[PDB]
């Protein structure tokens, strides 16, 4: 039948996932890094959606600076960053609220929460949460954002993390692998082979690298 | 349109629930009512489930004193112990298989808990009288002759104690005599929960009786 | 010990109930009594249903009449589609909402079947009250406006219909008149049902609720 | 979110509807669906030989089958020669056999083609329900279960050989089902909405093997 798989790699990152027990680890991995990455774009956009709600659209990154120590174009709803990484000109705020309401449903949905709640995850649900969020920004920004926009590159999955933080935190299918105990599943064999045909079990998601 | 309720009596007496604000009040309060005398009921089966879990089935309350002091001599299965209260007969299931029942009851009361506030999740009828069958299911799992009339465990799932003149009386809320109140005054019966909380805003609530 | 009991009044009207057979017949006759009364109004819950499924909620019985030809201005929602009886505002729920509604007055109709006896599966109170909760719910996110006092699916789902000079008045059997007959005898109400069944017998028991003042 | 009803048809015979999310991706569609088709022939298999079960008992191994007549036979209470000498024939007792008889006509209603002209799209879970609920009445005839080799139980647990049958043909495994739409092959890597726009929509289909 099914199983019910804990992919735990510690206390904020960790979700539940359900799938065929006779699945192949190869498949089982994929998916499951499809849901991991999903969660952790959902996480980089509230911080970046959030700014954009204040602020309005990302500076190019090569024309960054605080507006004052600069001629600017100021809208209705300007609003100086004070990081200097966003023009300013954000948009009415009472559509504002709605693009802050996506972003916090949005974390709920793949939030580490959901694994207390007894709820796996499916690539299904991130991804509508993610589309969500990007109807929201279009609701705010009928215009759209610019290529460079890190909520546009969120939302599209084409965010480059090389150099940050987040790196160590994205696991591509082509590299990811699948742990029990400590030790690897082959990619080849099937869920069964090493847990049978029988309760939840803790696994963790790596990369080869 | 949905409407989040938090009925709030105190610290560890409330819980979330979820319905259309186009609801009348009646019907919720009947509704939350039953959710509240589940929340109760599943706290009592917690204390007498466990003395069940140690000291086997009850004794009728007529007969009740601790074995060692009776006259007659107590007929003692595998797993007696003596229950010091003098309330069960000692005569407990295996201690493999009471672990069965004291999990089910850890269930229930944290299917009802105040925690699940802070979890911001809403009881339901179901999800509470469920737990509750399936402490039901490992009572039939330790005890397969099942219990006696009158032991405080089978009366708790079957909804018939009797509580009046004990401290928790005051703990139910029985449907026809139950009120919901909203901001310090009682809502009325008639009425829908739009009228009190609008159409499209959670609201703090209260449940009491006459 | 319990028992399990056959109340056959048709091959249409029928179900299976079980209880201790301790009860004394009046009890009893008055829990199958509601029950009965509850697959009676499923069985109506279902084909009221789906004409609100099809045309939105009742006209005032006062007021029906085709909407083609009705004079009075008639309000043609998103989802209008005139119902060819006169009886219904033609202004239904969206079709796809439409078959959530459709779905658990099935689901109900089923918890109250006549198969249930074959299946061996003895109707509660609970059971078909909740069926009709159901539906109730189903009603709600179809009309979240709510339907009128009136509307047959609202006397319906309260248990308030009137059917007092309706061909359905025979069906109906009020708990304080109903009558429970065993192998072509009323039984009394004070005694136990075990007085005409034994403390204990593997066989079930066919009997029949009729109301005061019939015959067998 | 927009959703789009798929109309399935392979004959007239094999054929229903199925509902998701126009954005879903081809490979996901046909997967489930590839379940959902699976699921309706194992419900078909089931109500031919859940009623012989009911008629005649459990099955003869594959390799001892013959007419009862044609060799000394035990008969039981309610002993009914097989007339293909498939089964043993000592069945359950005839009354009981109708809660299986019943179960599997409401198992084959549920997947039925006819749901087509009803407009009731098909779910897993639905078809798999069906399954469960001819599990349970096949164990209250059965007690003692039924044998490793009668096609009821292989056909409950998912396990038969079609290879060889006249079934093989309806089996699609998952990893080897293809989609198709106007008469030509959908790819797995794109999007529903890809072939049938982004905007509340119905669309005839196709299941097929590579």
């Given at each position: 039948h099914m199983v019910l798989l804990h992919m735990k790699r510690s206390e904020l990152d960790q979700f539940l996932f359900e799938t065929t027990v006779a699945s192949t680890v190869d498949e089982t991995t994929?998916?499951?890094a499809e849901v991991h990455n999903l969660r952790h774009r959902i996480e980089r956009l509230k911080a970046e959606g959030e700014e954009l709600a204040k602020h309005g659209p990302a500076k190019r990154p090569d024309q960054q600076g605080i507006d004052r120590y600069q001629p600017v174009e100021k809208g209705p709803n300007y609003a100086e960053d004070p990081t200097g990484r966003r023009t300013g000109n954000a948009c009415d705020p009472e559509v504002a609220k709605v693009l802050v309401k996506t972003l916090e449903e949005a974390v709920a949905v793949a939030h580490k929460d959901q694994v207390?709640?007894?709820?796996?995850?499916?690539?299904?649900?991130?991804?509508?949460?993610?589309?969500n969020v990007r109807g929201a920004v279009m609701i705010?920004?009928?215009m759209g954002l610019p290529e460079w926009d890190p909520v546009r590159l969120g939302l599209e999955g084409s965010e480059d993390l090389a150099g940050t933080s987040y790196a160590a935190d994205?696991?591509?299918?082509?590299?990811?692998?699948?742990?029990?105990?400590?030790?690897?599943?082959a990619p080849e064999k099937k869920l069964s082979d090493y847990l049978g045909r029988h309760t939840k079990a803790v696994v963790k998601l790596q990369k080869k690298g």
């Open positions: 994929r998916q499951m207390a709640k007894k709820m796996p995850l499916t690539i299904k649900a991130l991804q509508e949460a993610v589309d705010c920004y009928p994205e696991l591509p299918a082509d590299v990811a692998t699948l742990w029990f105990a400590g030790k690897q599943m």
